[PDB]
Design a protein around this ligand. Structure first.
Ligand SMILES: CCCCCCCC/C=C/CCCCCCCC(=O)O[C@@H](COC(=O)CCCCCCCCCCCCCCC)COP(=O)([O-])OCC[N+](C)(C)C
Ligand SMILES: CCCCCCCC/C=C/CCCCCCCC(=O)O[C@@H](COC(=O)CCCCCCCCCCCCCCC)COP(=O)([O-])OCC[N+](C)(C)C
Ligand SMILES: CCCCCCCC/C=C/CCCCCCCC(=O)O[C@@H](COC(=O)CCCCCCCCCCCCCCC)COP(=O)([O-])OCC[N+](C)(C)C
Ligand SMILES: CCCCCCCC/C=C/CCCCCCCC(=O)O[C@@H](COC(=O)CCCCCCCCCCCCCCC)COP(=O)([O-])OCC[N+](C)(C)C
Ligand SMILES: CCCCCCCC/C=C/CCCCCCCC(=O)O[C@@H](COC(=O)CCCCCCCCCCCCCCC)COP(=O)([O-])OCC[N+](C)(C)C
Ligand SMILES: CCCCCCCC/C=C\CCCCCCCC(=O)O[C@@H](COC(=O)CCCCCCCCCCCCCCC)COP(=O)([O-])OCC[N+](C)(C)C
Ligand SMILES: CCCCCCCC/C=C\CCCCCCCC(=O)O[C@@H](COC(=O)CCCCCCCCCCCCCCC)COP(=O)([O-])OCC[N+](C)(C)C
Ligand SMILES: CCCCCCCC/C=C\CCCCCCCC(=O)O[C@@H](COC(=O)CCCCCCCCCCCCCCC)COP(=O)([O-])OCC[N+](C)(C)C
Ligand SMILES: CCCCCCCC/C=C\CCCCCCCC(=O)O[C@@H](COC(=O)CCCCCCCCCCCCCCC)COP(=O)([O-])OCC[N+](C)(C)C
Ligand SMILES: CCCCCCCC/C=C\CCCCCCCC(=O)O[C@@H](COC(=O)CCCCCCCCCCCCCCC)COP(=O)([O-])OCC[N+](C)(C)C
Ligand SMILES: N#Cc1ccc(COC[C@H]2O[C@@H](n3c(NCc4ccc(Cl)c(Cl)c4)nc4c(N)ncnc43)[C@H](O)[C@@H]2O)cc1
Ligand SMILES: N#Cc1ccc(COC[C@H]2O[C@@H](n3c(NCc4ccc(Cl)c(Cl)c4)nc4c(N)ncnc43)[C@H](O)[C@@H]2O)cc1
Ligand SMILES: C[C@@H]1CC[C@@]2(OC1)O[C@H]1C[C@H]3[C@@H]4CC=C5C[C@@H](OCCC(CO)CO)CC[C@]5(C)[C@H]4CC[C@]3(C)[C@H]1[C@@H]2C
Lengths: 1105, 123, 168
């Protein structure tokens, strides 16, 4: 059948017939009038059945021969005289009119359906999600009216209570009862609002208009709101999203809905509210009017097991006005005050007139309701009852139903409502147990509800006690919440490619992920001996810093709102923000590169850049407070983050705004000096003190106190304890500023020689000038092999892959290799002794030198770039060569568009020759640079320098060249002037940032360099290899300075969050709106007090007469 | 004039990129020395005997649902932006200080008619 | 995905048709540049026949583009095809080439010295100018890139706007 509905759900049709009561309507021909009018006691008359079996009985006179023994007339039994079949009416209502064409779903099932099959319909078949609340609205059965005051408020909270909790509203569906005003509340307060409420309406099929219109299989129904005055039935309301229409077999009568509805309430309250929680989906009953069937229903619920509470609304109709009335005059449980029988029966006799016996009967039904006063809520809309029915509907389930504070909290957790938990579960004087709070935390973390994690920490949860191994090991192994498919992939990589099927994640495996994601020499606390030991054992399992471990969890699970929350709790705030930037950045890179599912890398990089911006904004806060302590914050060993450093973590993530912040640049400037005080010295004296060593003793240095924020070597720090003479020489030659100039003077004296060598004749054997040059380039290359081995990271292929990621290290490799190719050819050649340059091998070697020299001038940009101003312009050149590339590809096309016709028109009689490759490209390029070749244009002219080139067609070339230069200069050169001038500012801004970033790697490279330059560096090597075989900088803090520094960081995260709010709360946009939202409330309170004075005037006339 | 010519020119390039790419679904496989094969094969298969987005029935359904949901979000977010702006909150603030100011002097007039009752019920 | 479906999937991709046409077009200009720079005897060299084959078969491709354009109204198929710069220049570049091949090929060769025939000269010089259309057409292929394309499109918009400074 290709439909679960057709196979399972069943209709009902009165196959048998039973005529109406007795009476022929009028009109003597008794036989005719019988078949014409007479209803079946089914509910439909004889000609509506059609009931093919009964049809061959319709002809006789009907089914069932005549008088039929009046016992057997009433023997109508829906179980006996009515038949099932694969249903006809299930599809989609397409409400025509209204607006937007609101679209609902329906079905025509039998009341013989089992209760579970309806839950199988809503969820599996109609594709609905199981809710966290059900609101069963009973009330008016006949169309009524509400004060537009009382209308809109119930439409504020019945919505808001159903949006947040993903609730189902079970109505009657028919547009005559509560469903009208429930349905209207959907209208005014934007039921869509990007979050539709799954409003269901259960009605019986026998009483609804347009039954035929809803017939068909998966058919879109042209159903309309045509309230014909001649109609007798009800119209399906528009704004209800779903409908269940019981097929009682009869037509016309009500009744065959109340079973299914109550059984659906059971069938939902017998479902787990959420896989993590062990309650059932609660149910609440809401009331807007009522007759006897309603207040009887109210009694049922209070009697039920489990008891379903009730919310009555004073000011809405017959019952609800009464149920608040009788309830207000009542006491603790079960009473009327001594003289109230006369008054209350009169209200019954007036409010719903049955009269003095059915009043007293239903009055006794009202007694047993008021007995269970504890479950019923009487939210009265008059002034301020139960704080805005939202609270009342939701808090009503948190009343005398014996549910302990745990069960009270966990339900507000599933709903994701803290305002309830704050104001109604953490009420003054609550009876909390030992593990209830901790257990609710484990549920909030896994379900990713930060606002309860906040609430529980505030209300007494210590995350040191709640962070054991199995818990935090469980937290990674959860599908009960927002999970990361990226994590299980990262685990497969570190595990050599294997993944056993069950595989509960462990913490030693998370450690291998973080070590992989942070890279280099990072070593997590999960892979150490202390942890691996106690791990196999499981006070001693409590993680002294848990919020360092849940910040990683939140980030490996891609739970940002949890991450930013768990970040601002604890200490080491910048460090946690800079690790987090590196985790996501690596996850983004792996997620991008790894081809597993849809990318998710745009999400992770933004998460990285969010934490990377926090760290910068903190560093600015620290820096504006105390510049000296802020520089210490950059360089202290962390001891919880693998003995790393906040700079080292920012550099690790290529986080340029932190490295280009004016604190790092202020520190890097102070490491550049060393012990020297270059505030009260000058570069004249540093250079002179290099060439005149004894002048090292007459320039000023820094004390141990100015050097307290500056990281140092072990030896450098020991020599601050003592300033003697031999300490002032160590302090000088080991400064990065001194190593620099001491290398520039050697490098400038290098080029002066190597320029001299290349311009002067070169005999068979190298001159003294040339041996000094080979010594430099040789010893300089040993220096570079030393740089690679002592780089940072023990993984060799990374030492190499990072060293060739630098322009001037790649060119040195080319410049050094090329030079010894040149020296080999120069030196190892059979000299001729008649004329050099009869040896093509000596030529090659010399010409390699004459080109190798170019690498060594361009390298002066590495030394010029140490300056503030020069450096950025150096860095621009690369960024600008990259961006002009395509204007220059067009300029090269225009070149060959011209050079090939020019050469072909002027030189026809050419054989194939490699000169053709030159001549199509040579002169047209030199035209770009001012050379017009004025006397080679018009080769047939008298002033021509190419009169032999005159021939047929050569008059075309001046036209071609006129076009050529127009295109080059007047378009393509000025487009390029236009390019640069309109891209200068942002390339100059990036280039200041990139220069300030490379200034880290530059300066920190010079702590590592030896003292002596690259002719004399070999001494420093031989001394180092002699002291390596026979036998970086840290910020040393004493114990009282690590103390005062952590106090400094905490104080600056306070000022940060404070000033961030004070800026926001003091802004224009935020004061306009709080002004706006109070003129809301006041304007209501003036008309309220404007209404009261109207009720003060009435008293004046009252007390007057 | 560089910036606005460069901005138009990104737009015009992105427009011509339609005609360019959609021209290549139509092109044969072989380039214009060997394209003649693809022609002879096409004239041989034309005498002897563009791209559509095929959706099944359940994807035309889920797609029309997607469009309707996005016109909702469009009109909603267009109003929420407007109703939440400064100019619109200043004026609804303005138009209520109109009404309240009238209702204070109104209630400021009533209390003048409450004082008269005090002297009245006094004597 | 079977084997013969992976070949269909490849050669019928627009990215593949492109590069498969650029390599043929780049190898076209390399020949047609060689033909124009080297002496041209009475009969075309192998390099030049391959060039005529391209420009011929390439023109049949363009007649196919016009007929299979979109809209059955013929004068619209034509009016829309000549609304494109590089289709107009191909019409000039293709027509000019066969004027040139006709004069080059159908001339009474002299056998004492070429260029005593003013008709052979004209045909050759048409090739030496027709070559310009076929370089500029590399901007139609360079313009496939993000960055290059817009700068290509600027040149026209900027030649139009500088017109009156250049009249002065
Ligand atoms: C961190 C990375 C960056 C640093 C990179 C460092 C590595 C740089 C790598 C450098 C090596 C590059 C190649 C060297 C030259 C060989 C090739 C050549 O042209 O040979 C010639 C010389 O043949 C000889 O026999 C004479 C060689 C003399 C020694 C000079 C090279 C050794 C120094 C290397 C010091 C390097 C180590 C530096 C310190 C580590 C052969 O030709 P010929 O015999 O002259 O003439 C033959 C024909 N004829 C006889 C007819 C005329
Ligand atoms: C017909 C002639 C045509 C061409 C002619 C010349 C032009 C040829 C130009 C070639 C450069 C190609 C590199 C492109 C730029 C890439 C980006 C970059 O910053 O690169 C590098 C810097 O930039 C340079 O290294 C630029 C070097 C050329 C600038 C001019 C040199 C002046 C000295 C010579 C004077 C000699 C004069 C006399 C000589 C005899 C470094 O960056 P990176 O580490 O690679 O990082 C990539 C950036 N990213 C991370 C943001 C992605
Ligand atoms: C769409 C945009 C429009 C463009 C604008 C219009 C384009 C300009 C149009 C210019 C008109 C053309 C001028 C040539 C006229 C014929 C020459 C001739 O018959 O004899 C000459 C041949 O000389 C040549 O054949 C050289 C051809 C002229 C080159 C002009 C280049 C453009 C430079 C300017 C471009 C900027 C223009 C500025 C505009 C104000 C010489 O005479 P002869 O008797 O053969 O020989 C005598 C012997 N003798 C040589 C030994 C002495
Ligand atoms: C979608 C739109 C874009 C595409 C457009 C496509 C259409 C392009 C249109 C192209 C046609 C252009 C004109 C062709 C040449 C004729 C003019 C000429 O110079 O004749 C000469 C050659 O006269 C001959 O008799 C030899 C001709 C040889 C055949 C070459 C042309 C035919 C190929 C065409 C293939 C085109 C079709 C391509 C495929 C469809 C006459 O001079 P001569 O005899 O050499 O010398 C006389 C004097 N003398 C003897 C004293 C020296
Ligand atoms: C003395 C010399 C004077 C002049 C000299 C040269 C300059 C002569 C320039 C003439 C161009 C005239 C066109 C004006 C622009 C119109 C707008 C436009 O976009 O047009 C077209 C693109 O743009 C082009 O086609 C521009 C072509 C010239 C640019 C340079 C060519 C470089 C290659 C040659 C190198 C060869 C070098 C060697 C050769 C031997 C296309 O647009 P459209 O489809 O028409 O749509 C109209 C736009 N609208 C819809 C917005 C209205
Ligand atoms: C690697 C780094 C080393 C460190 C650098 C310091 C140590 C290096 C210092 C010196 C080493 C050189 C020894 C000098 C030998 C004297 C003979 C001589 O050269 O006579 C020449 C005169 O010219 C000179 O005397 C000057 C030669 C050097 C010029 C460059 C020096 C500047 C750099 C250093 C100082 C400034 C430092 C600037 C920066 C602050 C005559 O020419 P010839 O070639 O002898 O004659 C044969 C000619 N023939 C071949 C054509 C037949
Ligand atoms: C990776 C580095 C290694 C590079 C490869 C190894 C390079 C070493 C290669 C060769 C070493 C052996 C040299 C002799 C070659 C045989 C020919 C011969 O002997 O004599 C001939 C030389 O003919 C030449 O071509 C000489 C120049 C060739 C050197 C090319 C170096 C470029 C390498 C790239 C640059 C490095 C850049 C590297 C940057 C990364 C003739 O000279 P003759 O003997 O005097 O006889 C006179 C002839 N006569 C009778 C006609 C008058
Ligand atoms: C269109 C704009 C207005 C112009 C309209 C008017 C012009 C119309 C167009 C072209 C005019 C062509 C004739 C002029 C030459 C006469 C003199 C002559 O003989 O010159 C030379 C030959 O010249 C030729 O043989 C010409 C080649 C054919 C023209 C090719 C198209 C060029 C223009 C592109 C197409 C046009 C569209 C371009 C769009 C801008 C000299 O050769 P010779 O005689 O052998 O000399 C003896 C040599 N000896 C002593 C060394 C042995
Ligand atoms: C239309 C598209 C086709 C597709 C392209 C591929 C197929 C086309 C491939 C080949 C077809 C050509 C056959 C070669 C014949 C050999 C003889 C020869 O030419 O000898 C010459 C040497 O020069 C050469 O051998 C090279 C000649 C071609 C240069 C351009 C090839 C690059 C393009 C294609 C390849 C790279 C592709 C790049 C793109 C990725 C000697 O000169 P000559 O003229 O023989 O001697 C007479 C001289 N005379 C007249 C002065 C008296
Ligand atoms: C739409 C396309 C069709 C174009 C029109 C049809 C073109 C075909 C036209 C003509 C075909 C017939 C050629 C012969 C002409 C008569 C003269 C003659 O025979 O000999 C003379 C040639 O004199 C010349 O002028 C030769 C060059 C003319 C060709 C012009 C082509 C430009 C067309 C525009 C370019 C196309 C651009 C199209 C782009 C849209 C002399 O040469 P000879 O015979 O060797 O005698 C030696 C003389 N002597 C004794 C002095 C030494
Ligand atoms: N204090 C200080 C200080 C001293 C020197 C420097 C120079 O920095 C050198 C490094 O600067 C790097 N670099 C450079 N180098 C600039 C440059 C290098 C070579 C040449 Cl020929 C030129 Cl025309 C310009 N440009 C970069 C870029 N656009 N993006 C990222 N990195 C770039 C490059 O790896 C090179 O090794 C920077 C700061
Ligand atoms: N992917 C991709 C892609 C590939 C190629 C292209 C190139 O587009 C070609 C078309 O671009 C058209 N075109 C162009 N072409 C640019 C151009 C054409 C020729 C030359 Cl010589 C130059 Cl100096 C520049 N400019 C236009 C403009 N200013 N306004 C409207 N249309 C313009 C023109 O009709 C031409 O046919 C565009 C996108
Ligand atoms: C898309 C672009 C179009 C333009 C262009 O790039 C690509 O197309 C390329 C094709 C090249 C030619 C191919 C083959 C040869 C043969 C050789 O024959 C040696 C003979 C003898 C020496 O005497 C041996 O001993 C001489 C050189 C020549 C003609 C090339 C010249 C440059 C050309 C024209 C290039 C040009 C820059």
């Amino acid at each position: 059948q290709k439909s679960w509905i057709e196979s399972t759900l069943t209709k009902r049709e009165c196959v048998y017939i039973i005529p109406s009561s007795k009476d022929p309507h009028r009109c003597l021909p008794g036989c005719q009038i019988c078949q014409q009018l007479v209803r079946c006691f089914c509910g439909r008359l004889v000609k509506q059945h059609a009931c093919f079996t009964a049809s061959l009985a319709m002809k006789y006179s009907d089914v069932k021969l005549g008088e039929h023994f009046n016992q057997a007339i009433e023997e109508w039994s829906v179980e006996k005289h009515t038949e099932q079949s694969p249903t006809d009416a299930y599809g989609v209502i397409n409400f025509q009119g209204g607006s937007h064409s609101y679209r609902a779903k329906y079905v025509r099932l039998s009341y013989d359906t089992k209760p579970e099959i309806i839950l199988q319909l809503l969820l599996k078949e109609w594709q609905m999600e199981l809710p966290k609340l059900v609101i069963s609205v009973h009330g008016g059965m006949q169309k009524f009216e509400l004060h537009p005051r009382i209308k809109q408020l119930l439409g504020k909270g019945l919505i808001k209570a159903a949006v947040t909790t993903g609730a189902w509203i079970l109505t009657g569906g028919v547009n005559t009862g509560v469903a009208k005003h429930v349905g209207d509340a959907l209208k005014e307060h934007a039921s869509r609002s990007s979050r539709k409420i799954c409003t269901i309406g259960i009605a019986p099929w026998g009483v609804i208009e347009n039954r035929n219109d809803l017939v068909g299989r998966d058919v879109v129904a042209p159903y309309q709101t045509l309230l014909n005055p001649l109609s007798k039935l009800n119209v399906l309301n528009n704004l209800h999203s779903h409908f269940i229409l019981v097929d009682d077999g009869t037509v016309g009568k009500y009744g065959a809905e109340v079973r299914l509805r109550r059984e659906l309430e059971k069938t939902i309250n017998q479902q787990r509210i959420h896989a993590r929680i062990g309650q059932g989906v609660p149910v609440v009953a809401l009331i807007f009017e009522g007759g006897p069937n309603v207040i009887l229903t109210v009694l049922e619920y209070l009697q039920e097991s489990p008891p379903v509470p009730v919310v009555v609304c004073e000011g809405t109709g017959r019952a609800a006005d009464l149920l608040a009335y009788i309830h207000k005059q009542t006491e603790e449980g079960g009473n009327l005050p001594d003289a109230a029988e006369p008054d209350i029966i009169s209200t019954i006799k007036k409010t719903f007139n049955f009269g003095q016996s059915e009043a007293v009967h239903l009055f006794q039904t009202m007694m047993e309701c008021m007995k269970k006063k504890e479950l019923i809520t009487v939210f009265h809309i008059g002034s301020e009852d139960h704080q805005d029915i939202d609270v009342a509907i939701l808090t009503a389930l948190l009343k005398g139903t014996n549910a302990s504070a745990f069960d009270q909290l966990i339900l507000t957790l599933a709903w994701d409502r803290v305002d309830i938990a704050k104001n109604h579960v953490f009420v003054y004087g609550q009876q909390w147990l030992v593990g209830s709070l901790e257990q609710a935390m484990l549920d909030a973390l896994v379900m990713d509800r930060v606002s309860f994690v906040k609430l529980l920490i505030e209300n007494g949860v210590s995350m040191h006690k709640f962070l054991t191994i199995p818990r935090l090991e469980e937290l990674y192994n959860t599908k009960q919440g927002p999970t990361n498919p990226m994590l299980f992939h990262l685990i497969r990589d570190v595990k050599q490619g294997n993944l056993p099927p069950g595989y509960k994640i462990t913490l030693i495996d998370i450690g291998l992920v973080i070590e992989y994601l942070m890279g280099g020499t990072y070593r997590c606390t999960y892979t150490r001996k202390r942890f691996r030991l106690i791990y196999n054992s499981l006070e001693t399992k409590r993680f002294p810093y848990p919020l360092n471990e849940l910040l990683i969890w939140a980030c490996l699970m891609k739970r940002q709102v949890m991450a930013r929350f768990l970040w601002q709790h604890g200490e080491e705030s910048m460090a946690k923000a800079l690790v987090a930037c590196k985790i996501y950045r690596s996850m983004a890179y792996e997620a991008k590169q790894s081809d597993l599912v849809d990318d998710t890398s745009e999400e992770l990089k933004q998460y990285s850049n969010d934490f990377g911006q926090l760290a910068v904004e903190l560093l600015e806060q620290s820096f504006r407070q105390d510049e000296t302590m802020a520089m210490k914050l950059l360089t202290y060993e962390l001891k919880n983050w693998s003995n790393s450093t906040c700079l080292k973590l920012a550099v690790s993530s290529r986080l340029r705004p932190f490295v280009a912040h004016t604190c790092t640049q202020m520190l890097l400037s102070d490491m550049w000096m060393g012990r020297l005080n270059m505030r009260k010295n000058s570069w004249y004296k540093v250079i002179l003190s290099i060439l005149v060593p004894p002048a090292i003793l007459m320039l000023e240095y820094k004390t141990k106190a100015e050097m307290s924020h500056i990281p140092q070597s072990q030896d450098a720090h020991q020599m601050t304890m003592e300033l003697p003479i031999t300490r002032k020489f160590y302090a000088f030659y080991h400064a990065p500023i001194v190593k620099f100039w001491f290398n520039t003077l050697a490098y400038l004296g290098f080029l002066m020689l190597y320029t001299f060598v290349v311009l002067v004749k070169m005999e068979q054997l190298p001159s003294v000038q040339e041996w000094i040059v080979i010594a430099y380039i040789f010893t300089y290359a040993i220096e570079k092999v030393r740089e690679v081995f002592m780089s940072e990271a023990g993984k060799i292929s990374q030492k190499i892959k990072v060293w060739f990621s630098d322009y001037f290290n790649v060119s040195d490799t080319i410049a050094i290799i090329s030079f010894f190719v040149g020296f080999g050819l120069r030196f190892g050649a059979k000299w001729n002794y008649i004329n050099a340059y009869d040896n093509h091998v000596f030529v090659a070697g010399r010409l390699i030198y004459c080109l190798n020299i170019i690498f060594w001038y361009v390298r002066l940009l590495d030394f010029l770039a140490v300056n503030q101003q020069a450096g950025p312009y150096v860095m621009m050149i690369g960024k600008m060569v990259a961006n002009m590339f395509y204007i220059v590809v067009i300029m090269a096309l225009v070149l060959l568009s011209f050079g090939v016709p020019r050469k072909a028109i002027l030189y026809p009689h050419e054989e194939p020759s490699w000169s053709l490759a030159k001549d199509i490209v040579f002169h047209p390029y030199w035209m770009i640079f001012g050379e017009v070749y004025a006397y080679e244009i018009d080769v047939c002219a008298n002033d021509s320098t190419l009169p032999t080139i005159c021939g047929p067609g050569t008059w075309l070339t001046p036209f071609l060249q006129a076009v050529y230069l127009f295109v080059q200069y007047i378009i393509m050169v000025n487009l390029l002037i236009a390019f640069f001038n309109n891209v200068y500012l942002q390339v100059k801004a990036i280039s200041n940032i990139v220069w300030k970033y490379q200034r880290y790697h530059f300066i920190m490279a010079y702590h590592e360099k030896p003292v002596l330059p690259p002719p004399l560096i070999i001494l420093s090597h031989i001394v180092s290899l002699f002291c390596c075989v026979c036998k970086g900088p840290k910020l040393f803090l004493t114990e009282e300075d690590q103390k005062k520094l952590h106090d400094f960081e905490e104080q600056c995260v306070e000022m940060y969050f404070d000033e961030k709010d004070d800026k926001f709360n003091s802004g224009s946009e935020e004061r306009i709106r709080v002004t706006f939202e109070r003129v809301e409330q006041m304007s209501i309170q003036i008309k309220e007090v404007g209404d009261r004075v109207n009720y003060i005037k009435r008293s004046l006339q009252s007390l007057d007469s």
